[PDB]
RNA sequence: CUCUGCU
RNA sequence: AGUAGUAACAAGAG
């Protein structure tokens with residue numbers, strides 16, 4: 005009697021039990037050590053798929069560049085980056101013809117976005133490469149460093165607050181003959197200044213930082229991802245904005261819509277294909293990813309698509325949209341941390357930075373790394389490898405799906421000019437293509453035509469992990485369609501458990517996750533009760549907030565027991581204070597504070613909901629009652645939760661490991677910046693709720709506001725003559741401090 | 746709310762946009778923002794002036810209610826944005842799409858069952 | 872040559888307020904210097920109007936709403952109207 | 960002897 | 967030793 009869970013599929017169809025095929029209960033495979041090997045492998049692989057292209061040497065950066073555009077046509081089914089300019093232009097032209105005015109309307113919408121977009125938009129996003137520090141920094145921090153460097157270099161055209169002005173400053177910076185930056189060296193703190201030549205700054209402005217994608221499920225081997233610099237992101241935002249505007253106007257483009265919007269759009273489109281197909285016509289659906297999609301999406305083709313899309317538009321708009329593909333076509337990839345060398349005989353470790361691989365001897369490496377270094381050495385320049393071809397983890401997902409949907413629209417009977425035709429859905433590298441043809445031979449001919457056309461445009465379908473079946477069931481971006489999308493709960497299992505925001509936000513998020521899974525992922529009511537019980541147990545263990553009546557011993561047990569004895573109405577206690585769990589299927593949508601409000605003791609209610617408690621801290625409105633959640637698959641998600649701000653809405657300790665590094669000064673600067681901003685809010689309460697405006701320094705605004713507030717308070721009598729006198733004298737002293745400096 | 750019997754039926758849930766926060770229908774998002782600025786940050790309003798009578802009345806009642814409220818103005822502003830500004834969401838539903846029914850959607854509509862539930866309180870005439 | 876005359880025949884801080892305001896509004900002050908002179912004289916007259924006049928039983932009797940950035944000016948107006956009840 | 964446990 | 971797997975930990979920086 006050998007039990008075999010897989011045999012369950014003999015009765016339950018695979019899709020209906022697809023959740024069993026997801027091991028997401030276990031830990032995801034993480035990456036150990038450096039990502040330099042993965043970056044080198046990616047660069048070599050990208051240059052291998054385009055080897056038959058043209059080799060040139062950039063005249064500005066001096067690095068070799070490879071152009072596969074209009075290269076020899078593919079002669080084999082392997083991935084190939086030889087995209088044809090004529091074919092891509094033809095695909096875009098036919099997309100325009102089939103969807104008249106799409107490019108024009110999208111261009112105008114992008115025009116208004118470009119007009120009304122501010123520099124602060126670049127603050128969104130995470131782990132942005134900071135060229136000034138040669139490391140990844142938070143997007144806001146990298147933006148601030150770049151702005152400060154530009155100001156110190158005379159690029160004082162960004163104070164207008166418009167992103168386009170910042171882009172103008174970016175170009176002016178690249179055109180400068182020299183640059184000055186500020187770096188800290190400790191040997192004692194030294195605020196040294198470094199001078200960068202034109203070529204070095206150019207190389208470090210096109211540089212693309214690389215790391216290893218961690219916690220990635222479904223892949224045995226780890227892969228390297230990349231994040232761009234501050235200069236690139238500005239133009240990338242506009243490019244993406246235009247591509248997303250175009251995508252929203254395409255029925256086959258489901259990328260911009262997400263979640264249940266994505267599922268509904270895909271369901272409607274597949275239903276339309278099943279409907280408009282002739283009854284007598286044989287219908288098939290292909291499921292597949294595109295092999296080496298990111299490695300083959302050349303940026304020159306993106307430049308061609310942008311130039312075609314921006315036809316007849318104002319020349320400045322064409323420039324703003326086309327700059328990003330230009331820069332990416334001349335991009336560079338940082339290698340990363342480097343490698344680690346060990347000596348067993350002498351029993352010692354060492355880390356060799358990736359910048360010194362262009363000269364280190366090859367005897368220190370194993371065979372695989374030996375050949376990767378040998379192959380990538382020609383492209384190494386100033387610690388970075390030239391990666392002109394391909395798109396290393398490109399952010400042009402929107403543009404790439406525009407190209408895919410253009411090729412997908414090429415399958416209309418007015419374009420195929422044959423009995424067979426095709427349509428489907430495209431999203432980044434994933435696609436689900438439906439072929440209708442009178443007979444199986446027609447289906448095969450249509451499949452071959454689509455595959456060959458994709459090869460022409462540079463899209464390489466992955467024959468390895470793609471398959472065709474009769475229309476009705478398919479898969480698309482981890483969404484399994486079986487005559488209708490089926491719920492796959494295993495995807496949302498990692499979201500369960502303690503989120504780790506705070507006691508209140510984590511209770512609210514847990515109950516909201518259970519409720520959302522009931523609504524969307526077919527979480528039954530009994531299983532919902534199970535999930536609630538398990539989440540409460542995990543929450544109590546994590547937060548050491550077991551019920552006071554329990555004998556469990558923990559460093560927080562004494563206080564909870566004292567509170568339990570103190571309270572008269574036990575039911576009113578929150579779970580974070582040893583109170584019982586009153587949640588159920590009925591009230592998963594009610595915050596615990598409001599759920600237990602009537603049961604709370606008056607004094608306990610006041611203490612818990614005291615607005616003057618020091619635990620609660622409020623940042624800008626954009627970071628209130630919301631959290632960032634990372635699903636098993638997909639990008640970061642902004643989850644909003646309903647929670648009453650109580651003493652439990654505290655902040656966890658901040659990682660202090662930067663205190664014993666040469667770059668502590670940034671932390672100090674952050675502290676001071678906060679010290680200033682919080683005072684500005686003390687003078688302008690609405691600064692947090694909505695961003696303030698003005699050109700004057702903070703000191704001028706604060707002192708003027710203080711003076712006027714003093715006069716109004718005096719007139720209303722809220723302050724006496726002496727208080728007004730002291731306020732005025734302090735303001736005059738502040739003025740004198742500003743003047744003297 | 747009133748709970749009726751639970752009926753086990755072949756529920757067919759269709760994904761469609763519903764409202765999770767009905768908002769103050771008479772006041773568009775911009776009017777709600779102006780009212781919030783009036784109530785929470787009267788001095789930082791700027792040049793804006795309330796014209797719609799609904800704005801004046803709600804601003805009045807809220808100011809009277811919020812008298813001597815020590816709660817952080819930012820939290821009050823966020824809660825007012827939630828209360829006033831309409832917010833919609835695409836959700837698989839099977840019964841009424843009103844907010845009073847969407848918030849209890851997990852409780853009411855299931856994969857194989859429907860819980861006949863009538864939320865308490867007044868219901869919008871629209 | 873008139874802009875130099877305006878610079879040399881005005882209080883430095885008055886001309887500073889004029890130029891900062893104009894720069895806020897996005898006008899090149901080197902070409903349309905007539906508006907520059909007009910703004911400077913208007914600010915100057917407002918200051919004289921609010922000069923040496925104090926309310927006491929010393930405090931400035933007149934608060935110069937002009938010459939300060941738009942948000943600050945409207946903040947002053949709103950604060951005054953909220954405390955005294957004068958119509959905005 | 961001090962600092963750090965995502966920098 | 968062992969974890970682990972294409973590169974690391976088996977403390978690191980002063």
Ligand SMILES: *O[C@H]1[C@@H](OC)[C@H](n2cnc3c(=O)[nH]c(N)nc32)O[C@@H]1COP(=O)(O)OP(=O)(O)OP(=O)(O)OC[C@H]1O[C@@H]([n+]2cn(C)c3c(=O)[nH]c(N)nc32)[C@H](O)[C@@H]1O
Nearest residue numbers: 761762763764767770771840841842843844868869870871
């Ligand atoms: O939400 C639906 C509808 O309720 C489901 C809602 N709605 C209708 N009436 C009210 C109401 O009184 N109060 C509220 N709060 N909501 C109401 O609005 C939506 C109605 O639109 P929908 O159901 O999507 O389609 P339809 O009902 O056909 O609306 P519409 O196409 O705009 O037409 C409305 C009436 O016009 C009649 N009609 C149009 N034409 C051009 C003619 C005509 O030439 N001759 C005649 N005799 N009638 C015409 C339509 O038939 C329909 O009666």
